[PDB]
Each structure stands twice: as structure tokens, then as C-alpha cells.
Amino acid sequence: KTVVVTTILESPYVMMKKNHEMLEGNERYEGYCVDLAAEIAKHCGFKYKLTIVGDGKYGARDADTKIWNGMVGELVYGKADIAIAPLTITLVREEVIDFSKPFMSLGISIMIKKGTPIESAEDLSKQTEIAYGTLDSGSTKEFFRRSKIAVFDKMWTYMRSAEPSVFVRTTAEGVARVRKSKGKYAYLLESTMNEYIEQRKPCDTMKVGGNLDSKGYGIATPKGSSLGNAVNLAVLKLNEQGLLDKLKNKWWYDKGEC
Amino acid sequence: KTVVVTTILESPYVMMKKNHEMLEGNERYEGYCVDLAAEIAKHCGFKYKLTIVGDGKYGARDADTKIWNGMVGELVYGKADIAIAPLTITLVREEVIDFSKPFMSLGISIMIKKGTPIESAEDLSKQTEIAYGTLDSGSTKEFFRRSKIAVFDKMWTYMRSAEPSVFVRTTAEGVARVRKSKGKYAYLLESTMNEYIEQRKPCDTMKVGGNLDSKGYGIATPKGSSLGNAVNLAVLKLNEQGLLDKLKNKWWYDKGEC
Ligand SMILES: N[C@@H](Cn1oc(=O)[nH]c1=O)C(=O)O
Ligand SMILES: N[C@@H](Cn1oc(=O)[nH]c1=O)C(=O)O
Ligand SMILES: [Zn+2]
Ligand SMILES: [Zn+2]
Ligand SMILES: [Zn+2]
């Protein structure tokens, strides 16, 4: 009956409300995806329960145990009925789960501490003083591990062998590493997260260069789910009406601190 | 059997080659979608025949008869098996045909003759000395007809009742109208076509302001098509291989003449 929604604590998509300990259920959270979940649920006619993914990961298949972790795993093993999060539509995921059309368009980008003498991925590749990495588990890391493009393959060769590790467990961790590294660490992450952080105090980071690729985030459901069709139609309707743009403005720029 | 592909003569997606007179079948054409069709067919294992949509339209439903025209109609009534073209993924279309994940991201934009005193949608709506319109039977026209957003609603009320008509049969007609209007006509079209034309002689037009929305083009198939699943996964593979970005640079950037 009640649809179990798996999501992730990733700002500004889902965050704990300041007074969450005094609130119950869905009311404990706020964010772009919290607002989107309420709308998808109204338009599809279902009751739901927001739940934060237990391992705090997006979703990758372990080469070895072949088990899917993160939000993708929750859907694959039937622990959740739908994922409403900044989950990237990728070929490997689409093979095991269904995705609505994109509710957000984006691409991999570079985040630097202001003043870092880096303007592009080519710049990062040709040097070694400034370290750089990605989220330890996700579509960004996979983009690099599989690129057949020279500059990106060179970047992957470096990243996968860098010691100490240049990979981070969460986006917040990558952001803090950039902030505390005096310009010696650049972070590769999705343009959406980059743009958000650029509008957050202490306003010491910046998005540089163009996006490395083009892709989108989709609402995911277990392969063959009853919800897929309606959820997809809802995403298309909300985009055409302008709600998605409204929500991005609300969470990225209307409340910007810089 | 041989897959009948419906497409549209729209630069730089599908254009007749220079020496087309001495050529046959698929060899008569070139463009982004011609290359995309070859890739899709290779990956999905099918032979095909490129056919240009009979009525030269993208696809809209007649309010009276409820009959679909354009490439959409060809799929709906079984005249074609798949549409590989700059066909916009929309809610009304998604209800009658299937769309793969987007192979290209875009948004509605404004095309002006160089020097025209317009910097955005808001500017067009504020005055009436400069006429502006859209393509007939497409997603752009629907966008303005179904928009509750103040500026867009106002622009639509002007366009709908405009005399002479500000609507055009083909993108080429819209571009030619802007070029010969002495700056008295602006044209609303997708950013993709806009930026392509911006880089072509006589280099007298330009895209102004940001996109009005964010959407994508998808490869479409009739509901229940045996090809749907495979073409969708093929689009995801091409994007990740970097092939889609390669074709985009090939047909837009390289060979840009301004
Ligand atoms: N949305 C990404 C997670 N992730 O966020 C980034 O910024 N990079 C990255 O891999 C995914 O779905 O795997
Ligand atoms: N891709 C559009 C056709 N069209 O091209 C534009 O530039 N505007 C417009 O409506 C469609 O699929 O209807
Ligand atoms: Zn709503
Ligand atoms: Zn290929
Ligand atoms: Zn009629």
C-alpha cells in the first residue's frame, strides 16, 4: 500500500530539518527531492514513506559478489519501491532497474578551491601538484574507469593509483577536502552539486570549465514495477509545467548564500 | 525484416548530400541522425531504410479528428517502425508512442537577426513592433499554448491571434523570415537548431537569452514495439561511449563557418 521511497542524504536534495527530532516521518526531511517526492506521489495517487538508503551509497554492482549496493540495490532486492534522488540514468543501471525520463539534466564538472590554477580536465591531466578525485562509488567514477578518451583515460590512470586515495565516501567529504587543501585538491562531481556548493558559505569553491558529458537523473523503480508508467508521465508533466525549474531555483539560487 | 525509419529533412540532422543525384537509398543523406541511425542499427542488429516523413511535420494531434500527423502519426498508424530525428520527448506524445532516453538535451530559445533590440522572452512580450512566432505542428508551439507562466502566456495570446500569421511550416522558413525581416521578426526554436544556424553563413543571426525550458530528443517507436527495449539501451551505450558528443561536435562545431 504505502510506497517505500529510498533516497540519500545529499544536499540540497534531502537534508535533515533543523528540528527533525521533534517531527515525525516524512516531515523530518526537506529538500528538492523531498518536494519532488510529495508531488510525484500526489500525481500518481499514492501514499509513501521516505527512507534514507542504509549504506549511504548511490548504487554499484560489486565485481566479484555481483551484489548491487546503494539505492539501486534497495530496488533490486525489493527493499524499496521507488528511488527519488539525484540518481544518474546509466546503461548498467537501466539493465536492472527502470528509470523515468530525466527530471534534471547535468554533466561531470570540476570543483576547485578559488584561485587554483586549473581551468579544465586537460589542465588536471597535464599536471601533478594538484590532486583530484571522485565520489568513491558512483557514475562519475565509472565514467573515468571506462572512458576511451585520452584525457579522461590519463586522469583515470592517475586517480586509480594515487596514494593516499583521492576518492571520497560522500559528496560533503569531497567538498571539505577541496576546502581544506589550499588548492592542492580539485574534485570531480556532477554540475548540479557543484553549482549548489558554489552558492554556499564560505563561498570558497567554484565550478571551472564546461561539463565533461551530458546525462540526467531519473526516478527509479524495480524492473517491471506497477508505478513506472505513471511516475514517468508525472515527471514529464511536472517538467512541462515548470515545477522542476521552480524547485531547482528554490533550492539552488533563491536561498543562495553568496 | 527491414526497419522503416521515418525522419525529417532538418539541418544538420538529415540533409541531402551534395552529389545526391547519383546516389541511392540511405546514401543520399547525411547528418547527425543519419550517423545515429547507422549506429543504432549496428548495435541493435537491424537493416533499415531512411524515409522522409510524408507531410514534413514533427507531430501534433488534430483537436477535432484526434488524428496524429507528422512522424508521430506515421508511428501511430504503422507507416514507419521507428523515428530517428530531433523529436522532442513530451507528455502528449509519450501517451501514444514510446521514447528512448534522450540522445540530446535542449531547450526553447530565441533567434534574432543581429542587432535586434531583444535580449529575452520577457523583452518580446513587452513590445509588439517586433513580430515573433514558432514552428507549426511541433512541441514549441504546444509549449506556449499550454503555458501558465505569465510571460509565455502573454506571448501565446499575441501569437495565436497574430495577423499576418507568425507561424511557419518549416524551421528553414522561420530562419528565412528572420533573415529577410530587417530585425522585425524573431523566431522561437530549439537551442540545437538555433546554435547550428548561428554558425552558418551569412552569419547574420544569433541566439539571445537562456533556454526557456530543459528537455530532450528521443528515438521513438510505436507502443509495444519489439525494437523499443534495444534502441533505448543503444542510446545509453552511445552516450557513454562518447559517440553522441562526437557526432554533436562533428555536425555543429567542426564545419562551423563563422
Ligand atoms: N548521481 C551519481 C552519484 N555521484 O554524484 C556525483 O556528483 N558523482 C557521482 O558519482 C550516481 O547516481 O551515481
Ligand atoms: N523537435 C520539435 C520540432 N520543433 O523544432 C523546433 O525548433 N521547434 C519545434 O517545435 C518537435 O519534436 O516537435
Ligand atoms: Zn502538482
Ligand atoms: Zn558504435
Ligand atoms: Zn482539423
Euclidean distance between CA atoms B12 and B33, whole angstroms: 8
Q: What spacing in Å lies between the alpha carbon of B175 and ligand 2's midpoint?
A: 13
| Residue bearing cell 596514494 | A163
AA identity, residue B180: K
CB proximity under 8 Å: A 185-224 to B? 213-216, 218
Q: Does A11 touch chain B (CB under 8 A)?
A: no
Euclidean distance between CA atoms A250 and A199, whole angstroms: 12
Q: Does A190 appear as a known binding residue? A: yes
Do B236 and A105 make contact, defined as CB atoms within 8 angstroms? Answer: no
Residues B101 and B220 in one domain: yes
Do A245 and B94 make contact, defined as CB atoms within 8 angstroms? Answer: no
Euclidean distance between CA atoms B5 and B74, whole angstroms: 10
Taking alpha carbons only, the member of B76, B119, B133, B108 closest to residue A240 is: B108
Do B102 and A102 make contact, defined as CB atoms within 8 angstroms? Answer: yes
Residues B129 and B180 in one domain: yes
Range of the structural domain that residue B94 is part of: 1-106+216-255
* Pair A25, A50: CB distance under 8 Å: yes
Residues of A within 8 A of B218 (CB-CB) are 101
Method of determination? X-ray
Residues A101 and A179 in one domain: no
Nearest-by-CA chain A residue for B234: A91
Residues of A within 8 A of B44 (CB-CB) are none
Residues B65 and B33 in one domain: yes
Q: Does B191 appear as a known binding residue? A: no
- In the three-class reduction of DSSP (H, G, I as helix; E, B as strand; rest coil), residue A209 is classed as coil
Do B89 and A105 make contact, defined as CB atoms within 8 angstroms? Answer: no
Taking alpha carbons only, the member of A251, A113, A86 closest to residue A174 is: A113
Euclidean distance between CA atoms B160 and B236, whole angstroms: 38
Do B242 and A89 make contact, defined as CB atoms within 8 angstroms? Answer: no
Residues B166 and B247 in one domain: no
* Pair A106, A189: CB distance under 8 Å: no
Reading phi first (left if > 0) and then psi (alpha if -120 to 50, else beta), residue B45 is in left
* Atom of ligand 1 minimally distant from the CA of A59: 13
DSSP string of chain B? --EEEEE--BTTTBEE-TTGGG--GGGGEESHHHHHHHHHHHHHT--EEEEE-TT-----B-TTT--B-HHHHHHHTTS-SEE-SS-B--HHHHTTEEE-S-SEEE-EEEEEETT-S--SHHHHHH-SSSEEE-BTTSHHHHHHHT--SHHHHHHHHHHHH-SS---BSSHHHHHHHHHHTTTSEEEEEEHHHHHHHHTSTT--EEEES--S--EEE--EEETT-TTHHHHHHHHHHHHHHTHHHHHHIIIIITT---
Nearest protein CA to atom 13 of ligand 2, as residue? B138
- In the three-class reduction of DSSP (H, G, I as helix; E, B as strand; rest coil), residue A153 is classed as helix
Residues with CB under 6 A from ligand 2: B 58, 86-88, 135, 138-141, 171, 189-190, 193
Q: Does A102 appear as a known binding residue? A: no
* Pair A239, A90: CB distance under 8 Å: no
Euclidean distance between CA atoms B65 and B61, whole angstroms: 8
The CATH number covering residue A162 comes to: 3.40.190.10
Residues A123 and A159 in one domain: yes
* Secondary structure element (H or E) that encloses residue A205, with its range: strand A205-208
Strand-strand pairing, B215-217 and B104-106: antiparallel
Residues A123 and A203 in one domain: yes
| Residue bearing cell 601538484 | A129
Lookup: cell for A176: 571539505
Among A101, A148, A215, beta carbon nearest to B89: A101
Sign of CA dihedral B40, B44, B50, B53: negative
Euclidean distance between CA atoms B239 and B258, whole angstroms: 28
Residues B8 and B93 in one domain: yes
CA distances (Å), A143 to each of A172, B239, B240, in order?
A: 20, 11, 7
Residues whose CB is less than 8 angstroms from the CB of residue A63 and which lie 6 or more positions away in sequence, other chains included: none
Nearest-by-CA chain B residue for A241: B147
Euclidean distance between CA atoms B61 and A7, whole angstroms: 38
Residues just before a chain gap in chain A (C–N exceeding 2.5 Å) are: none
Q: What is the CA radius of gyration of chain A?
A: 18
Lookup: cell for A144: 573515468
* Best of B53, B58, B141, B198 for a ligand 2 pocket test (most atoms within 8 Å of beta carbon): B58
Residues B43 and B30 in one domain: yes
The reported resolution of this PDB entry, expressed in Å, is: 1.6
Residues with CB under 6 A from ligand 1: A 58, 86-88, 135, 138-141, 171, 189-190, 193
Q: Which ligand is nearest to the CA of B239?
A: 4
Euclidean distance between CA atoms A248 and A12, whole angstroms: 9
Euclidean distance between CA atoms B244 and B252, whole angstroms: 12
Do B239 and A215 make contact, defined as CB atoms within 8 angstroms? Answer: yes
Lookup: cell for A167: 576518492
Residues B221 and B99 in one domain: yes
* Pair B186, B127: CB distance under 8 Å: no
DSSP string of A4-30? EEEE--BTTTBEE-TTGGGS-GGGGEE
Among A91, A214, A236, beta carbon nearest to B236: A91
Read off the DSSP letter of residue A249.
I
Helix axes A32-44, A228-241, angle to 10 degrees: 120
Q: Does B99 touch chain A (CB under 8 A)?
A: yes
Euclidean distance between CA atoms A218 and A85, whole angstroms: 8
Lookup: cell for A242: 515548470
Residues whose CB is less than 8 angstroms from the CB of residue B208 and which lie 6 or more positions away in sequence, other chains included: B109, B110, B111, B112, B116, B118, B119, B120
Domain count, chain A: 2
Residues A83 and A3 in one domain: yes
* Pair A37, A6: CB distance under 8 Å: no
Strand-strand pairing, B82-83 and B104-106: unpaired
- In the three-class reduction of DSSP (H, G, I as helix; E, B as strand; rest coil), residue A126 is classed as coil
| Residue bearing cell 544569433 | B206
Do B242 and A147 make contact, defined as CB atoms within 8 angstroms? Answer: yes
Euclidean distance between CA atoms B83 and B210, whole angstroms: 29
Do B102 and A101 make contact, defined as CB atoms within 8 angstroms? Answer: yes
Q: What spacing in Å lies between the alpha carbon of A43 and ligand 3's midpoint?
A: 6
List A216's β-bridge partners, or say none.
Answer: A105
Residues whose CB is less than 8 angstroms from the CB of residue A153 and which lie 6 or more positions away in sequence, other chains included: A147
Residues A101 and A115 in one domain: no
Residues whose CB is less than 8 angstroms from the CB of residue A99 and which lie 6 or more positions away in sequence, other chains included: A87, A89, A93, A218, A219, A220, B101
* Pair B200, B109: CB distance under 8 Å: no
Backbone angles phi, psi at B103, to 5 degrees: -95, -10
AA identity, residue B22: M
| Residue bearing cell 541493435 | B44
Residues of B within 8 A of A91 (CB-CB) are 233, 236-237, 240
What is the helix, strand, coil percentage profile of chain A, to 5? Answer: 40, 20, 40
Taking alpha carbons only, the member of A116, A45, A58 closest to residue A88 is: A58
Lookup: cell for A93: 543501471
Q: Does B143 touch chain A (CB under 8 A)?
A: yes
Rounded to the nearest angstrom, the minimum Cα separation between A94 and chain B is: 8
Among A101, A149, A245, beta carbon nearest to B242: A149
Q: Does A56 touch chain B (CB under 8 A)?
A: no
Lookup: cell for A181: 587543501
Residues of A within 8 A of B105 (CB-CB) are 105, 214, 216
Interface-testing mutation among B89, B90, B91, B148, with chain A (most A C-beta atoms within 10 A): B91
